[model samples]
Target: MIIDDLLTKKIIKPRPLNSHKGTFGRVLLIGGNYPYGGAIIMAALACVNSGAGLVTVATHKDNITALHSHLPEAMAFDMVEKDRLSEQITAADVVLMGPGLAEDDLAQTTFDVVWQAIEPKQTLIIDGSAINLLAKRKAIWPTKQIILTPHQKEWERLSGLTIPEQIEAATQTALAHFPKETILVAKSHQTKIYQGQKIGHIQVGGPYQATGGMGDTLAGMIAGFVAQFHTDRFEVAAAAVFLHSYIADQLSKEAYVVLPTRISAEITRVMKEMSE
Candidate 1:
């Protein structure tokens, strides 16, 4: 299925004045270990701008200052604190784990805590290094409202398919092993969202987006979209995927390169444009 403006128009509807922040939805984002703090920061920026009601970050203690400096709209805490991590997981309407999340002891513990604490009702988006970690494990995966956002290499690790072998049919075969509700955002120049037998293809975006933090921003948008739109998870994800690139495609006309942060900054205005 093609994810185009028509599909996006249906999903990005005008907000009701009767709603509050809580009505939008609370999101918990986990990742950003010591060295790569900007990944989660980018995710948070996109999440907040994408209009998630309440956003929180569980990351390295040192990253909090930088995260606060970038996006104060989001709450930040130390991911090392197991109890606090568990609490945050329980509270979020959506949980986005991974993004500059290094696969060290700290990352492992954090991943384990999230797996144990996350409820089936909450949406879980596993991205970046967390997907790598999951590739190494054999545990049972949660089968409801889960999303995996992975670039070509990351998808290669998780699905055991080389870039060339990741054709639509083969990818669907790999997805059969996961939860029926699992959604896969396979990132590339031509990104596709796969859920069971359904596949959504995005035709926007270009080489201008070939940079870091792009996938992180898309993960955040997906988190934000699913948190608020209680419709079909597949539709929500496809909308988010379309808008992320649709915005970049708009900005790329005049810009030499579309930075992830630039995409985050444009989200609100473009979303409003679509909402109307």
Candidate 2:
């Protein structure tokens, strides 16, 4: 379906007047190990602002201080602590991974652990280096409740389709390889959200948003939206995509370029309007 107020209204309806944090959802984010810590921090910033009930992050120990400095709302721990990582995954209603997840031995090990920890009941969004890792390694995946956010080249690596070959027909054919329930956010200047046979294209966003950390922020929003909205998963993802760029489009009218964190910062306000 086309993304619009009607679509998001169903996914982002008013929250219950008398509800607790658990009523929204708990999110667990993993990645940003070692040198790539900032990526996870950006994701956490987006997720918390998107209004997830509870947000936790698993990353390099060194990253926690910086993350907390930006977002005290999120709880965090070291990713290398296998037991704590598994516990967080189990506790989370939604899990997002791969932002700045460098393709190293540590990244691979954590990826493997996440793979083994996942259950069919939880939603999983794989982005950034995890998408690259998935492309490089022909690994088995949890079929249902999966979302992949990949830009053209990342999509190319994951789907084996060159940029030109990424049209609907070809993308459809390539999409078949993934689970029937998997949602694909094929991000580009013209971003398309697809799941099964249906596709939703987003008209917002521009060159100003063409910077690093943008996808990571979008991934976090997806994780938050999916966690809170117990509606059609595809539409939830689509709404998140719409809101991300729509926020940018709003800022773009005044500024020459919009930063990822700026988009994230606006998320709370826009969502507040949506809830109204």
Candidate 3:
């Protein structure tokens, strides 16, 4: 199931005039525990720009000011506050973990807490370092709606499938090993979305998007879309994936490298146009 322009347009329609903030959705993004604080910041900016009603980030103590500077619309807290982290997880319509969360002791601790705290109804998106952690631990998969966003190398590490071997069937085989309904956003030159029998292929993006923090932006947009759009999680995930690259591709016509922040600023306008 390729998510082409028509389907992507249909899924990313604009919000109704009478909708309130709750109509959009609340997203709690965790991770960015230490030196890599910029990762979660990028994700938070993208989420807020993607039209999530409320966005909050739990990161290293030092990261709050930077996150607040970049996106005042989002709330920030320290990752060390386990009680607060757990509460945020419980309240979030979508909880995103990873995004610069290095594979260190702290990352592991945060990942464990997220796994233990996220409810079955919440949509959990695992990316970056969290995928690496899962690769090593092989822990029991979470029961919630799971969305895995991995680059080629990270996907190789988690699925034990080489880049070349990550064809549709091989990807499907790996998907079978996880929960039945998990969505895999295999990020590459040609991104693919896998959910049970549905397979969404996107061809709008290009090598110009091959830079750091790109996955973080995509992960955040997916979180925002899933939280706000009360539709099938798989379709929302696929639509978000399509919109991320589609926007970048449109921008690439004028610029050489589309920076992650630049992409974030355009999300609202692009989404609104798509809705039209």
State residue 163's C-alpha deviation in candidate 2, in Å. Answer: 0.9
Alpha-carbon runs more than 4 Å astray in model 3: none
TM-score of every model versus the real structure: 0.98, 0.96, 0.96
Per-residue lDDT of 1-276 in model 3, one digit per residue for the tens? 678778878788667889788888899998777899889999998999988999989899998999988988898999889899889988888888889888888888888898888787778899988889878876565564889998889989988899889888998998888888899988888888998878888878988898888988998999889988887888888899989998999899998999899999999988888888
lDDT digits (tens) for residues 109-177 of candidate 2: 999898899988899999988999787777467648999998788889888899988989899889998
Candidate 2's clash total is 0
Error of 1 at 239 (Å): 0.7
Please report, in order, the local distance difference test score of every candidate based on alpha carbons.
0.91, 0.88, 0.87
Off by over 4 Å in 1: none
The clash numbers for all candidates, in the given order, read 0, 0, 0
Number of clashes found in candidate 1: 0
Candidate closest to the true structure, highest lDDT: 1
Better of 2 and 3 by lDDT: 2
Once model 2 is optimally superposed onto the true structure by TM-score, how far is the C-alpha of residue 178 displaced, in angstroms? Answer: 1.4
State residue 264's C-alpha deviation in candidate 3, in Å. 0.6
Residue 118 in candidate 3 has what lDDT?
76
